[PDB]
Coordinates of C-alpha atoms and ligand atoms in Angstrom, one line a residue:
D41 CA 0.0 0.0 0.0
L42 CA 2.5 2.7 1.2
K43 CA 5.6 3.3 -0.8
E44 CA 8.3 1.4 1.1
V45 CA 11.6 3.3 0.5
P46 CA 14.9 1.5 1.0
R47 CA 16.8 2.2 4.2
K48 CA 20.0 2.4 2.0
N49 CA 18.6 5.6 0.4
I50 CA 17.6 7.1 3.8
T51 CA 20.1 9.2 5.9
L52 CA 19.5 11.1 9.1
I53 CA 21.0 14.6 9.0
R54 CA 19.9 16.5 12.1
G55 CA 17.6 16.1 15.2
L56 CA 14.7 18.6 14.8
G57 CA 12.4 17.9 17.7
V64 CA 11.9 13.8 14.9
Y65 CA 14.7 14.1 12.4
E66 CA 15.8 16.2 9.4
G67 CA 16.4 13.7 6.6
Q68 CA 17.5 13.1 3.0
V69 CA 16.6 10.4 0.4
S70 CA 18.9 9.6 -2.6
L79 CA 15.2 15.3 -1.5
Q80 CA 15.1 17.0 1.9
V81 CA 12.5 15.2 4.1
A82 CA 11.5 14.9 7.8
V83 CA 11.8 11.5 9.5
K84 CA 9.6 10.3 12.3
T85 CA 11.0 7.3 14.2
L86 CA 9.4 4.5 16.3
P87 CA 11.2 3.2 19.4
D97 CA -0.6 2.3 15.8
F98 CA 2.2 3.8 14.0
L99 CA 1.7 1.8 11.0
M100 CA -1.6 3.8 11.0
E101 CA -0.9 7.5 11.3
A102 CA 1.1 7.3 8.1
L103 CA -1.7 5.4 6.4
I104 CA -4.2 8.2 7.3
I105 CA -1.9 11.0 6.2
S106 CA -0.9 9.1 3.1
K107 CA -4.6 9.0 1.9
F108 CA -4.9 12.8 1.9
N109 CA -4.1 14.9 -1.2
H110 CA -4.1 18.6 -0.2
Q111 CA -1.6 21.5 -0.1
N112 CA -2.4 22.4 3.5
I113 CA -1.7 18.9 4.9
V114 CA 1.8 17.6 5.2
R115 CA 2.7 15.0 2.6
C116 CA 3.7 11.5 3.4
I117 CA 6.8 10.9 1.2
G118 CA 7.1 7.2 2.2
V119 CA 7.9 4.7 4.9
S120 CA 10.8 2.4 6.1
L121 CA 9.1 -0.6 7.8
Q122 CA 11.7 -3.1 6.5
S123 CA 14.5 -2.2 8.9
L124 CA 14.3 -1.1 12.6
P125 CA 13.7 1.5 13.9
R126 CA 10.7 2.0 11.6
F127 CA 10.6 5.4 9.8
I128 CA 7.8 7.5 8.2
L129 CA 9.1 9.9 5.6
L130 CA 7.2 13.3 5.6
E131 CA 7.2 16.7 4.0
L132 CA 9.9 18.8 5.7
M133 CA 8.4 21.8 7.5
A134 CA 11.4 24.0 8.3
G135 CA 9.3 26.4 10.3
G136 CA 8.4 23.8 12.9
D137 CA 5.1 23.8 14.8
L138 CA 2.8 26.9 14.8
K139 CA 2.6 27.2 18.6
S140 CA 6.3 27.7 19.0
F141 CA 6.5 30.0 15.9
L142 CA 4.0 32.5 17.3
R143 CA 5.8 32.5 20.6
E144 CA 9.3 32.9 19.2
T145 CA 8.2 35.4 16.5
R146 CA 6.3 37.6 18.9
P147 CA 6.8 41.4 18.1
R148 CA 9.3 43.0 20.5
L155 CA 5.0 39.9 11.9
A156 CA 1.7 41.5 10.7
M157 CA -2.1 40.8 11.1
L158 CA -2.2 39.5 7.5
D159 CA 0.4 36.8 8.3
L160 CA -2.0 35.5 11.0
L161 CA -4.9 35.6 8.5
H162 CA -2.9 33.6 5.9
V163 CA -2.0 31.0 8.6
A164 CA -5.7 30.9 9.6
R165 CA -6.8 30.6 5.9
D166 CA -4.2 27.8 5.4
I167 CA -5.5 25.6 8.2
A168 CA -9.1 26.4 7.2
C169 CA -8.5 25.1 3.7
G170 CA -7.0 21.9 5.1
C171 CA -10.0 21.6 7.5
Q172 CA -12.4 22.2 4.6
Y173 CA -10.6 19.4 2.7
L174 CA -11.1 17.1 5.7
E175 CA -14.7 18.2 6.0
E176 CA -15.4 17.5 2.3
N177 CA -13.8 14.1 2.7
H178 CA -15.8 13.3 5.9
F179 CA -12.7 13.0 8.1
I180 CA -12.7 14.4 11.6
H181 CA -9.4 15.6 13.0
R182 CA -10.6 15.9 16.7
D183 CA -7.5 17.8 17.8
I184 CA -7.1 21.0 15.7
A185 CA -4.6 23.1 17.7
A186 CA -1.6 25.3 17.0
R187 CA 0.7 22.6 18.3
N188 CA -0.5 20.2 15.6
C189 CA 0.2 22.6 12.7
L190 CA 3.5 23.0 11.0
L191 CA 5.1 25.7 8.8
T192 CA 7.0 25.2 5.5
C193 CA 9.5 28.0 6.0
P194 CA 9.6 30.5 8.9
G195 CA 10.0 33.7 6.8
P196 CA 7.3 35.2 4.5
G197 CA 5.8 32.7 2.0
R198 CA 5.0 30.5 5.0
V199 CA 2.4 27.8 4.4
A200 CA 0.7 26.3 7.5
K201 CA -0.3 22.6 7.2
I202 CA -2.0 20.1 9.5
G203 CA 1.0 18.0 10.7
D204 CA -0.5 15.6 13.4
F205 CA -3.3 13.1 13.1
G206 CA -2.6 11.0 16.2
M207 CA -5.9 11.8 17.9
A208 CA -8.0 10.7 14.9
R209 CA -5.9 7.5 14.7
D210 CA -6.2 6.7 18.4
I211 CA -10.0 6.3 17.9
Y212 CA -9.8 4.8 14.4
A223 CA -5.4 14.9 31.6
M224 CA -4.0 14.2 28.2
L225 CA -7.3 15.0 26.5
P226 CA -7.5 18.4 24.7
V227 CA -10.4 19.8 26.7
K228 CA -9.7 23.4 25.8
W229 CA -10.2 22.7 22.1
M230 CA -13.3 20.5 22.6
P231 CA -17.0 21.5 22.4
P232 CA -19.4 20.4 25.2
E233 CA -20.9 17.4 23.4
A234 CA -17.4 16.0 23.0
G238 CA -18.9 12.3 23.9
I239 CA -20.0 13.0 20.3
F240 CA -17.8 14.1 17.4
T241 CA -18.8 15.8 14.2
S242 CA -17.2 18.1 11.5
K243 CA -18.6 20.8 13.8
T244 CA -16.3 19.5 16.5
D245 CA -13.3 20.6 14.3
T246 CA -15.2 23.9 13.8
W247 CA -15.0 24.5 17.6
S248 CA -11.4 23.6 17.9
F249 CA -10.6 25.8 14.9
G250 CA -12.2 28.7 16.7
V251 CA -9.8 28.0 19.6
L252 CA -6.9 27.6 17.2
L253 CA -8.0 31.0 15.9
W254 CA -7.6 32.4 19.4
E255 CA -4.1 30.8 19.7
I256 CA -3.1 32.5 16.4
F257 CA -4.3 36.0 17.3
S258 CA -3.1 35.8 20.9
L259 CA 0.3 34.9 19.4
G260 CA 0.6 31.4 21.0
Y261 CA -1.0 31.8 24.5
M262 CA -2.6 28.9 26.2
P263 CA -6.4 28.9 25.9
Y264 CA -8.3 30.0 29.0
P265 CA -4.9 31.1 30.4
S266 CA -5.5 30.9 34.2
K267 CA -8.1 28.0 34.0
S268 CA -7.5 24.2 34.4
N269 CA -9.2 21.5 32.2
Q270 CA -12.0 21.0 34.8
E271 CA -12.6 24.7 35.2
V272 CA -12.7 25.2 31.5
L273 CA -15.1 22.2 31.2
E274 CA -17.6 23.8 33.6
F275 CA -16.9 27.4 32.3
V276 CA -17.7 26.4 28.7
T277 CA -20.7 24.2 29.7
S278 CA -22.2 27.2 31.5
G279 CA -21.9 29.4 28.4
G280 CA -18.6 31.1 29.2
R281 CA -16.3 32.0 26.3
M282 CA -12.8 33.5 25.9
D283 CA -12.4 37.2 25.6
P284 CA -10.8 38.7 22.5
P285 CA -7.0 38.2 22.4
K286 CA -5.1 41.5 22.8
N287 CA -5.5 43.9 19.8
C288 CA -7.8 41.3 18.0
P289 CA -10.1 42.9 15.4
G290 CA -13.8 42.5 16.0
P291 CA -14.4 40.7 12.6
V292 CA -11.8 38.0 13.5
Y293 CA -13.2 37.6 17.1
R294 CA -16.7 37.3 15.5
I295 CA -15.4 34.2 13.6
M296 CA -14.2 32.7 16.9
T297 CA -17.5 33.5 18.6
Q298 CA -19.7 31.6 16.0
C299 CA -17.2 28.8 16.0
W300 CA -17.9 28.4 19.7
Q301 CA -21.7 28.3 19.4
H302 CA -23.2 25.9 21.9
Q303 CA -25.4 24.0 19.5
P304 CA -23.3 22.4 16.7
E305 CA -25.7 23.0 13.8
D306 CA -25.5 26.8 14.5
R307 CA -21.7 26.8 14.0
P308 CA -20.4 27.4 10.5
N309 CA -18.8 24.8 8.2
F310 CA -15.3 25.5 6.9
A311 CA -16.5 27.0 3.6
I312 CA -18.2 29.7 5.5
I313 CA -15.2 30.1 7.8
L314 CA -12.9 30.6 4.8
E315 CA -15.3 33.0 3.2
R316 CA -15.3 35.0 6.4
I317 CA -11.5 34.8 6.8
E318 CA -11.3 36.0 3.2
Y319 CA -13.6 38.9 4.2
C320 CA -11.3 39.9 7.0
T321 CA -8.4 39.7 4.5
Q322 CA -10.3 42.2 2.3
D323 CA -11.0 44.5 5.3
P324 CA -8.1 47.0 5.8
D325 CA -9.2 48.0 9.3
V326 CA -8.5 44.4 10.2
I327 CA -5.2 44.2 8.3
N328 CA -3.8 47.6 9.3
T329 CA -4.3 46.8 13.0
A330 CA -1.0 46.6 14.8
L331 CA -0.1 43.5 16.8
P332 CA 0.7 43.7 20.6
Ligands
3DK1 C1 11.5 22.3 14.9 N1 10.7 21.2 14.3 C2 10.4 20.9 13.1 C3 9.6 19.7 13.1 C4 9.0 19.0 12.0 C5 9.3 19.4 10.7 N2 8.8 18.7 9.6 C6 7.9 17.7 9.8 N3 7.2 17.0 8.9 C7 6.4 16.1 9.5 C8 6.6 16.3 10.8 C9 5.9 15.5 11.8 C10 6.4 15.1 13.0 N4 5.5 14.4 13.7 N5 4.3 14.3 12.8 C11 3.2 13.6 13.4 C12 3.2 12.1 13.1 C13 3.2 11.2 14.2 C14 3.2 9.8 14.0 F1 3.3 9.0 15.1 C15 3.2 9.3 12.7 C16 3.2 10.2 11.6 C17 3.2 11.6 11.8 F2 3.1 12.4 10.8 C18 4.6 15.0 11.7 C19 7.5 17.4 11.0 C20 8.1 18.0 12.2 C21 9.5 19.4 14.5 N6 10.2 20.3 15.2

């Protein structure tokens, strides 16, 4: 099924997080000390905003999965490290990028169930970045450690509207510039806070239009939340608005 690439052709260059690799083509190598199936899931996707599975090395040990090299690393760490001391449109492109990928999943009736900044990767760190969904461990596991801050109330049900909720929270992560959702609240506090109707305030300097996308992502009833086509449409509207784009980051 998956393209078994000879170990002879594979060489490990550098430890990234989890290796920088080459094949006799610069790739990223994920090693195993289940795992047969994250690669099988990622392999079946064909979209520009989802990391590509180059191949696998299950012949020798330790078993590899060859993946599209994302030199910019995860999105959570990027926001943190690249915090002004980067413009609003850079955030909007990142948001659009993941929204496209989510739309692709939604169209293909796949539920991610863990859409967060820590599961998104960046191609290069500088301008011309492309954010892509890099982790699918949660959706595999099914097919304290639970991501409660990204989950809607009815999650124990899971829909495409689940991913809509978590994307709203991802949206906050982006425009907060990498802050932890519900900053001073624990999983159980957030659980009861959300269940009561409580929602996160706008991140510092966040334009109203963008916060309004977060707000309707967090609608209590799933059928009232927007699909990702509408979300993109609305992100595109923000990208047209100059009052949104001209707003200076904190
Ligand atoms: C600084 N930094 C860069 C990276 C990085 C760069 N490029 C990358 N390309 C693919 C990855 C990656 C790493 N883990 N995953 C999740 C994953 C986990 C798994 F168990 C099986 C497959 C799989 F894709 C994707 C990946 C990670 C990690 N840290």
